Amino acid sequence: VSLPRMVYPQPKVLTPCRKDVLVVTPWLAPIVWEGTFNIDILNEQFRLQNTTIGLTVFAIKKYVAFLKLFLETAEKHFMVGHRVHYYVFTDQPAAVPRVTLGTGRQLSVLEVRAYKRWQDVSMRRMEMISDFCERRFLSEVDYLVCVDVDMEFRDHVGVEILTPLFGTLHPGFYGSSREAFTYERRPQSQAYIPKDEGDFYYGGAFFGGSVQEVQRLTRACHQAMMVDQANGIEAVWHDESHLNKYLLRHKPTKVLSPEYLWDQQLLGWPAVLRKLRFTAVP
Numbered sequence: 001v002s003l004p005r006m007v008y009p010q011p012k013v014l015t016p017c018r019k020d021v022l023v024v025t026p027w028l029a030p031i032v033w034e035g036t037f038n039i040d041i042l043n044e045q046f047r048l049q050n051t052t053i054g055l056t057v058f059a060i061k062k063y064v065a066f067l068k069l070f071l072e073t074a075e076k077h078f079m080v081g082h083r084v085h086y087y088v089f090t091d092q093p094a095a096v097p098r099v100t101l102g103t104g105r106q107l108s109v110l111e112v113r114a115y116k117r118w119q120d121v122s123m124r125r126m127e128m129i130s131d132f133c134e135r136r137f138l139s140e141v142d143y144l145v146c147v148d149v150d151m152e153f154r155d156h157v158g159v160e161i162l163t164p165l166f167g168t169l170h171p172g173f174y175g176s177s178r179e180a181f182t183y184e185r186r187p188q189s190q191a192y193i194p195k196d197e198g199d200f201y202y203g204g205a206f207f208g209g210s211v212q213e214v215q216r217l218t219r220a221c222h223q224a225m226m227v228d229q230a231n232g233i234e235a236v237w238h239d240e241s242h243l244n245k246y247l248l249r250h251k252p253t254k255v256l257s258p259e260y261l262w263d264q265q266l267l268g269w270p271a272v273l274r275k276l277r278f279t280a281v282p
């Protein structure tokens with residue numbers, strides 16, 4: 001489907017869009033920072049495809065408290081103008097707040113079991129996302145975005161992120177050398193990455209892609225975690241460690257800057273971040 005006539009500033013071939021950051025990976029995946037995209041062009045492209053975006057979030061045990069702000073702020077900032085399906089995984093159906101949604105947006109509550117250890121609650125998201133990539137997501141959405149719940153949206157998070165497979169630069173380590181990355185370093189774990197390998201340290205709190213690619217990632221991470229469990233080892237940063245192994249070996253087709261995953265209490269507001277889009281609740 002052809003784009004309509006649009007009036008916007010001409011791209012400047014001989015002017016970099018950012019002079020302070022890397023905006024494309026060495027495998028030619030865009031790194032998404034403010035100033036790299038014209039959202040009007042992208043909105044047109046994705047609306048003409050009638051794109052539906054699923055957003056998964058786990059609110060298990062006491063984390064149900066985070067849902068109200070998460071959903072209210074998602075309504076202000078997440079894929080506004082596009083079709084959205086929220087999927088709230090919880091052990092407490094009745095504790096999901098009644099948040100008023102804009103048109104073309106819906107929410108499903110998916111009841112799941114609560115594991116005792118926070119590590120297992122975090123890790124079993126991979127299994128649960130993979131399982132539902134079959135039950136619901138393949139028929140209901142085009143893309144999945146999988147995030148932590150103890151967060152709020154403060155600025156635009158839109159179709160600029162959508163791509164077959166994306167990860168997000170962890171806010172603690174975007175300026176770190178690979179040897180300093182907290183990858184799993186024990187060869188006995190499936191998540192093992194040697195000191196001389198690694199592109200980026202991706203945050204477990206924000207990843208996504210097409211349903212097919214998210215199914216692949218989440219199943220791979222789950223199956224890897226089950227191998228580790230059988231061998232009596234648990235990766236240093238749990239699902240995040242396995243996510244990082246997967247994305248090393250299967251390069252993402254976009255990488256999101258730390259604008260998309262931030263903690264202002266711990267890290268402030270650096271000049272390199274023109275926007276703080278999705279942030280930790282302090």
Ligand SMILES: CCCCCCCCO[C@@H]1O[C@H](CO)[C@H](O)[C@H](O)[C@H]1O[C@@H]1O[C@@H](C)[C@@H](O)[C@@H](O)[C@@H]1O
Nearest residue numbers: 170171172173176182203204237240262263266280
């Ligand atoms: C090196 C510079 C020294 C400073 C390093 C600052 C980042 C530390 O970050 C932790 O990183 C871990 C991996 O190594 C896990 O991803 C953990 O979930 C994360 O904590 C999370 O994200 C943080 C941003 C906070 O929101 C914290 O409350 C979260 O639990």
Ligand SMILES: C[C@H](N=[N+]=N)C(=O)NC[C@H]1O[C@@H](n2ccc(=O)[nH]c2=O)[C@H](O)[C@@H]1O
Nearest residue numbers: 058059060061063118119121122148149150
């Ligand atoms: C602080 C934390 N710790 N744990 N695990 C965490 O953020 N875990 C990742 C996500 O796992 C989910 N979670 C974790 C523990 C829990 O009791 N309930 C829950 O929903 C939330 O969606 C969290 O955002």
Ligand SMILES: [Mn+2]
Nearest residue numbers: 148149150205
């Ligand atoms: Mn957390």
